Design a binder for these strands. Sequence first.
DNA 1: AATTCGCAGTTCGCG
DNA 2: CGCGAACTGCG
Length: 756
Amino acid sequence: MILDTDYITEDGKPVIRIFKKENGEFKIEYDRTFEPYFYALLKDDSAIEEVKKITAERHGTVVTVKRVEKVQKKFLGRPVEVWKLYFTHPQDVPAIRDKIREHPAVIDIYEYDIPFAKRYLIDKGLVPMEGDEELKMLAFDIETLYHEGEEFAEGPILMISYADEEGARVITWKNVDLPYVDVVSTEREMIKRFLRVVKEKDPDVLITYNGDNFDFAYLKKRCEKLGINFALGRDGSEPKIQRMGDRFAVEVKGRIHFDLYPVIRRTINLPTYTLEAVYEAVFGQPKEKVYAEEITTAWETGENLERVARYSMEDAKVTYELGKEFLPMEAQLSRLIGQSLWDVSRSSTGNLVEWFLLRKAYERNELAPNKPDEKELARRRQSYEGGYVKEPERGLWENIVYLDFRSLYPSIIITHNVSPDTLNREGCKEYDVAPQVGHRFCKDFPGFIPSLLGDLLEERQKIKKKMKATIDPIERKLLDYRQRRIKILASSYYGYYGYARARWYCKECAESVTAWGREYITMTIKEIEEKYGFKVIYSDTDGFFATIPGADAETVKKKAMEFLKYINAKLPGALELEYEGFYKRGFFVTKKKYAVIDEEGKITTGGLEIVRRDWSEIAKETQARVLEALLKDGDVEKAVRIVKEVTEKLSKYEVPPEKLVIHEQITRDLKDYKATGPHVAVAKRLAARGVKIRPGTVISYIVLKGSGRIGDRAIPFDEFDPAKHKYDAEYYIENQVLPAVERILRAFGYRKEDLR
DNA sequence: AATTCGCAGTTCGCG
DNA sequence: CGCGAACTGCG
């Protein structure tokens, strides 16, 4: 199985290293025969000679164009003559590429920014994370000495905990009488001890939690001041810290540093992404937190050091149990994109799609288009029309069916071959024309993108089939992870079209897809009202809720099924309305604010506060019991006696503060907030005491009794002392609970005023 | 650093 | 200075 790739230099020449685990065994294949290159497009072939003479300086070294090669490729399906420019060393490319594109005789250059090792995996058609190979995983977390205002890592590391299938231990340099704590004399011995453990456990995967921004920058700076060789790598190297713009990320050669923090971000939407939060969110058992100053004083006074022990022990234990769950999922995502687990696990949705297209593009001899420079990214400004959203018949309805399309936007792409290479291609025999916007899409050949979309969805379909007939439950779970990722890969195509930074961005492709979507959704709605007498209560992009007023619970179901038969015959290609489910009751608040309950009693919400991190758990909780009292019980009164009793629990301060915390995210540098709400209030006030505040931090604040701006009374939740803090009850009534149930209960002749 | 669509609370500035 | 828009966050 392939694990990662990189290169080392050997006498000025690159050497690809491929890290394999072929049957329990770590192996390193070396490839000295791979040449870094990029692509040039010229005015005449007669320019190649003046281009080849182009030369650049690196680190005192002179950079030359090794050799040139003429090739034919397809740029956007058109045949294009291009000169492949070859180089002796990968680091030659970023030096010279600029000085080449500025040549008069060169129109542009392409695939000039592919990481040598990633390019190896493409060009050679190699795929990471492939095979039956069980990986040895080790998680680890640290604890540090935190005194405020200190520089980063000035204070020593107090503990280093780690976990695997055999359990957890903690390495520390004070006495703690716990059978899983190992005592040593000095912070240095502890580090060199942990360094030994990793060497003799020889894990394939090193699992942290935010190790890219904390645990590995500390372990490095401390290894600096203490002067320790941090030979974690299977080749003996130190953790290689890399700068991914905003933050950092750490690699460890011969292994896979699996930082879960970026995995949980992309994969799960949670209120806060603290390790403690995430562990309770994934496995349902609590995990208590121990805060920095508690760690400090407990370490200094030498008291209650057992408590800091189990915190650290449970940081490592959780982090393994977590990495255990999320690793195969990201293993299959690695296999699907064709790039290292380390890479994809840190990648955004757009980057994931592009690496996959970059692979397919190379397989189909398609010159990849560049990424937009500043100007092109500016002309990628004006937006397009999205879906059709129907201003709903606000209120409660009974006996309801939700019908939607099976994969509207991917199915539209395959059906009408929406692809930048088919868009308006002259000289075809057949075209599909897109509504409202009228782009022509050539039908004579499958487009680049639609060819992949179909291949994906078909492959997804074979997989489910192999799942159901397979016998190896390890295999089944893996397959399942793959197709779920294929689903999400498929369903990431339309956005990629309108993603302003994308290499294959096609605005035209994107608005086309939404224009069709609206024709298909609108026509299906007219044909269910006029032709089949349903009433369309609400409709959003790819589906609608409908009912036949006054008809039976089991009539509506049946006549719906009849309309599927009807409408599907009328829908071209893979377009297809399907029966999603039936809901004995459903309340519709506004556009994109709804809640249906099925015949079993499960309640599903959409756009509702009950599911937002920026609303307090007391609101979301009360709104839910409100939704139960209507949909599940029909008790409109109880839905008011519930609010009337919850408001009294706040006016008498009888409700836990832990419910009143509001979580919001920071999306920029604090210097860039044109206007300061309450989370930037606390954030500014927090980084003023010196805490790191990245774009992405979740501020978890609470609103205190007082007057004025909401922010002037906000405090981060950790600083909340209930004995010397009276939280603002009036706010959590008139700004948090009531406005979240008042829209549901105004529909019954109830005003906020008869809700306290 | 996937898209458009849309609700709404906080703040501040305008008549 | 009551109200509406800019700013913001997030499904």
